Design a protein around this ligand. Sequence first.
Ligand SMILES: O=C(O)c1c[nH]c(=O)[nH]c1=O
Length: 228
Amino acid sequence: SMTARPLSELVERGWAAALEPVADQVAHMGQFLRAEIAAGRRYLPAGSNVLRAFTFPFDNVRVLIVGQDPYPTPGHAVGLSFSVAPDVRPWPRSLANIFDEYTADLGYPLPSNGDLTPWAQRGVLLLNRVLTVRPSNPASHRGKGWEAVTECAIRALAARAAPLVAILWGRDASTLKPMLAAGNCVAIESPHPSPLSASRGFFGSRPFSRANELLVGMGAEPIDWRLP
Ligand SMILES: O=C(O)c1c[nH]c(=O)[nH]c1=O
Protein backbone atom coordinates (compact mmCIF):
# COMPACT_ATOMS: atom_id res chain seq x y z
CA SER A 1 0.00 0.00 0.00
CA MET A 2 1.68 3.16 1.46
CA THR A 3 5.45 2.70 0.69
CA ALA A 4 4.37 0.34 -2.22
CA ARG A 5 1.86 2.45 -4.30
CA PRO A 6 2.01 6.13 -5.36
CA LEU A 7 -0.37 8.88 -4.05
CA SER A 8 -2.28 8.73 -7.43
CA GLU A 9 -3.79 5.46 -6.00
CA LEU A 10 -3.81 6.06 -2.15
CA VAL A 11 -5.76 9.41 -2.15
CA GLU A 12 -8.32 11.42 -4.22
CA ARG A 13 -6.92 12.92 -7.50
CA GLY A 14 -6.95 16.52 -6.01
CA TRP A 15 -4.97 15.51 -2.83
CA ALA A 16 -2.44 13.38 -4.83
CA ALA A 17 -1.41 16.59 -6.70
CA ALA A 18 -1.41 18.90 -3.60
CA LEU A 19 0.74 16.38 -1.59
CA GLU A 20 3.30 15.86 -4.45
CA PRO A 21 5.96 17.82 -2.47
CA VAL A 22 5.78 15.10 0.32
CA ALA A 23 5.29 12.01 -1.98
CA ASP A 24 8.66 10.58 -0.72
CA GLN A 25 7.97 11.63 2.91
CA VAL A 26 4.72 9.59 2.65
CA ALA A 27 6.76 6.69 1.11
CA HIS A 28 9.17 7.11 4.12
CA MET A 29 6.20 6.98 6.58
CA GLY A 30 5.28 3.66 4.89
CA GLN A 31 8.84 2.39 5.77
CA PHE A 32 8.65 3.70 9.38
CA LEU A 33 5.41 1.68 9.95
CA ARG A 34 6.73 -1.59 8.39
CA ALA A 35 9.70 -1.18 10.82
CA GLU A 36 7.19 -0.71 13.73
CA ILE A 37 5.47 -4.07 12.85
CA ALA A 38 8.91 -5.77 12.26
CA ALA A 39 10.07 -4.52 15.72
CA GLY A 40 6.79 -5.94 17.20
CA ARG A 41 5.00 -2.63 18.04
CA ARG A 42 1.55 -1.93 16.49
CA TYR A 43 -0.02 1.31 15.19
CA LEU A 44 -3.45 2.91 14.69
CA PRO A 45 -5.34 3.18 12.55
CA ALA A 46 -5.07 0.20 10.08
CA GLY A 47 -2.74 0.93 7.07
CA SER A 48 -5.77 1.55 4.72
CA ASN A 49 -7.23 4.30 7.06
CA VAL A 50 -4.04 6.31 7.77
CA LEU A 51 -4.63 8.69 4.78
CA ARG A 52 -8.49 8.54 4.78
CA ALA A 53 -8.95 12.36 5.35
CA PHE A 54 -7.50 12.74 1.78
CA THR A 55 -10.00 10.27 0.12
CA PHE A 56 -12.54 13.19 0.23
CA PRO A 57 -11.99 15.80 -2.52
CA PHE A 58 -9.33 18.50 -1.89
CA ASP A 59 -11.28 21.04 -4.09
CA ASN A 60 -14.36 20.57 -1.78
CA VAL A 61 -12.65 21.52 1.54
CA ARG A 62 -14.32 24.62 3.13
CA VAL A 63 -13.44 23.92 6.84
CA LEU A 64 -10.36 22.31 8.47
CA ILE A 65 -10.65 20.54 11.91
CA VAL A 66 -7.15 19.57 13.22
CA GLY A 67 -6.50 17.41 16.31
CA GLN A 68 -3.13 16.15 17.62
CA ASP A 69 -3.01 12.39 16.78
CA PRO A 70 -5.39 9.38 16.41
CA TYR A 71 -7.38 7.70 19.26
CA PRO A 72 -4.88 5.48 21.17
CA THR A 73 -7.54 2.80 21.89
CA PRO A 74 -7.92 -0.17 19.48
CA GLY A 75 -11.30 -0.06 17.63
CA HIS A 76 -11.57 3.82 17.81
CA ALA A 77 -9.21 5.52 15.23
CA VAL A 78 -10.79 5.30 11.69
CA GLY A 79 -8.41 7.79 9.94
CA LEU A 80 -10.87 10.74 10.18
CA SER A 81 -9.89 12.93 13.21
CA PHE A 82 -12.25 12.41 16.25
CA SER A 83 -14.59 10.05 14.27
CA VAL A 84 -15.37 6.50 15.50
CA ALA A 85 -17.22 3.73 13.60
CA PRO A 86 -21.04 4.03 13.89
CA ASP A 87 -21.36 0.95 16.22
CA VAL A 88 -18.84 2.28 18.86
CA ARG A 89 -19.92 3.25 22.44
CA PRO A 90 -19.05 4.62 24.90
CA TRP A 91 -17.84 7.60 22.74
CA PRO A 92 -14.23 8.58 23.61
CA ARG A 93 -14.46 11.37 26.30
CA SER A 94 -12.92 13.72 23.60
CA LEU A 95 -15.94 13.09 21.25
CA ALA A 96 -18.55 13.27 24.11
CA ASN A 97 -17.15 16.84 24.81
CA ILE A 98 -17.13 17.78 21.04
CA PHE A 99 -20.85 16.78 21.18
CA ASP A 100 -21.62 18.83 24.39
CA GLU A 101 -20.12 21.88 22.60
CA TYR A 102 -22.03 20.85 19.39
CA THR A 103 -25.44 20.80 21.20
CA ALA A 104 -24.52 24.05 23.15
CA ASP A 105 -23.25 25.94 20.01
CA LEU A 106 -25.83 24.87 17.39
CA GLY A 107 -28.93 23.89 19.47
CA TYR A 108 -29.14 20.48 17.64
CA PRO A 109 -29.57 17.28 19.78
CA LEU A 110 -26.89 14.61 20.62
CA PRO A 111 -25.81 12.69 17.49
CA SER A 112 -27.03 9.04 17.36
CA ASN A 113 -23.39 7.74 17.10
CA GLY A 114 -19.75 9.01 16.64
CA ASP A 115 -19.48 8.62 12.80
CA LEU A 116 -18.43 12.09 11.46
CA THR A 117 -18.42 10.69 7.88
CA PRO A 118 -21.09 13.37 7.09
CA TRP A 119 -18.79 16.34 7.95
CA ALA A 120 -16.16 14.80 5.59
CA GLN A 121 -18.81 14.32 2.80
CA ARG A 122 -19.70 18.09 3.34
CA GLY A 123 -16.24 19.76 3.00
CA VAL A 124 -14.89 19.42 6.58
CA LEU A 125 -11.34 17.95 6.43
CA LEU A 126 -10.88 15.84 9.61
CA LEU A 127 -7.07 15.93 10.07
CA ASN A 128 -4.58 15.16 12.83
CA ARG A 129 -1.15 16.89 12.91
CA VAL A 130 0.14 13.25 13.17
CA LEU A 131 -1.68 10.39 11.32
CA THR A 132 -0.58 7.38 13.49
CA VAL A 133 -0.18 6.45 17.19
CA ARG A 134 1.23 3.36 18.94
CA PRO A 135 -1.74 1.78 20.83
CA SER A 136 -2.31 3.21 24.39
CA ASN A 137 0.53 5.83 24.00
CA PRO A 138 -0.85 9.29 23.13
CA ALA A 139 1.74 11.30 21.09
CA SER A 140 4.03 8.19 20.49
CA HIS A 141 4.53 9.04 16.73
CA ARG A 142 5.15 12.80 17.34
CA GLY A 143 8.15 13.97 15.23
CA LYS A 144 8.33 10.67 13.23
CA GLY A 145 7.84 12.45 9.84
CA TRP A 146 3.99 13.00 9.77
CA GLU A 147 4.34 16.77 10.54
CA ALA A 148 5.89 17.64 7.12
CA VAL A 149 2.82 15.93 5.47
CA THR A 150 0.04 17.67 7.52
CA GLU A 151 2.00 20.97 7.09
CA CYS A 152 2.24 20.39 3.27
CA ALA A 153 -1.51 19.52 3.24
CA ILE A 154 -2.38 22.81 5.05
CA ARG A 155 -0.11 24.91 2.78
CA ALA A 156 -1.72 23.37 -0.32
CA LEU A 157 -5.25 24.21 1.07
CA ALA A 158 -4.32 27.86 1.89
CA ALA A 159 -2.81 28.17 -1.68
CA ARG A 160 -6.25 27.28 -3.21
CA ALA A 161 -8.32 30.05 -4.86
CA ALA A 162 -10.98 28.94 -2.29
CA PRO A 163 -12.35 30.06 1.10
CA LEU A 164 -10.85 28.18 4.10
CA VAL A 165 -11.64 28.28 7.87
CA ALA A 166 -9.33 26.33 10.22
CA ILE A 167 -10.37 24.98 13.66
CA LEU A 168 -7.14 24.07 15.53
CA TRP A 169 -7.60 22.00 18.72
CA GLY A 170 -4.52 21.86 21.02
CA ARG A 171 -0.87 22.97 20.74
CA ASP A 172 0.30 20.38 18.11
CA ALA A 173 -2.56 21.57 15.81
CA SER A 174 -1.78 25.29 16.57
CA THR A 175 1.82 24.79 15.13
CA LEU A 176 0.03 24.86 11.69
CA LYS A 177 -1.22 28.47 12.38
CA PRO A 178 1.87 30.07 10.68
CA MET A 179 1.20 28.24 7.32
CA LEU A 180 -2.35 29.78 7.61
CA ALA A 181 -0.76 33.33 7.62
CA ALA A 182 -2.81 33.64 4.33
CA GLY A 183 -5.60 36.32 4.59
CA ASN A 184 -8.09 34.15 2.56
CA CYS A 185 -7.64 31.51 5.36
CA VAL A 186 -8.80 32.57 8.92
CA ALA A 187 -8.06 30.33 12.03
CA ILE A 188 -10.10 29.42 15.16
CA GLU A 189 -7.69 28.43 18.01
CA SER A 190 -9.18 26.79 21.16
CA PRO A 191 -7.75 24.27 23.65
CA HIS A 192 -8.15 20.53 22.82
CA PRO A 193 -11.54 18.93 23.65
CA SER A 194 -9.77 16.13 25.69
CA PRO A 195 -10.83 16.23 29.40
CA LEU A 196 -7.21 17.19 30.38
CA SER A 197 -7.66 20.55 28.45
CA ALA A 198 -11.46 21.01 27.70
CA SER A 199 -12.28 23.21 30.78
CA ARG A 200 -9.33 25.46 29.65
CA GLY A 201 -11.67 27.07 27.03
CA PHE A 202 -12.83 24.30 24.64
CA PHE A 203 -16.32 24.39 26.27
CA GLY A 204 -18.21 27.53 25.08
CA SER A 205 -15.62 28.08 22.24
CA ARG A 206 -18.61 27.84 19.78
CA PRO A 207 -16.40 26.68 16.85
CA PHE A 208 -19.24 25.43 14.56
CA SER A 209 -21.40 28.65 14.44
CA ARG A 210 -18.20 30.78 14.31
CA ALA A 211 -16.82 28.71 11.39
CA ASN A 212 -20.16 29.31 9.55
CA GLU A 213 -20.15 33.06 10.49
CA LEU A 214 -16.63 33.24 8.88
CA LEU A 215 -17.57 31.23 5.71
CA VAL A 216 -20.67 33.49 5.14
CA GLY A 217 -18.25 36.47 5.48
CA MET A 218 -16.08 35.03 2.59
CA GLY A 219 -19.27 34.48 0.47
CA ALA A 220 -18.83 30.66 0.90
CA GLU A 221 -21.70 28.32 1.94
CA PRO A 222 -21.89 27.42 5.66
CA ILE A 223 -21.19 23.78 6.68
CA ASP A 224 -24.37 21.79 7.45
CA TRP A 225 -23.03 20.54 10.86
CA ARG A 226 -26.30 18.66 11.59
CA LEU A 227 -25.57 14.96 12.42
CA PRO A 228 -28.16 12.13 12.42
O1 LIG B 1 -6.53 15.28 18.54
C1 LIG B 1 -7.05 14.28 19.07
O2 LIG B 1 -7.01 14.00 20.29
C2 LIG B 1 -7.66 13.25 18.18
C3 LIG B 1 -7.62 13.35 16.84
N1 LIG B 1 -8.13 12.40 16.04
C4 LIG B 1 -8.69 11.24 16.51
O3 LIG B 1 -9.13 10.35 15.78
N2 LIG B 1 -8.72 11.17 17.87
C5 LIG B 1 -8.23 12.10 18.76
O4 LIG B 1 -8.32 11.89 19.97
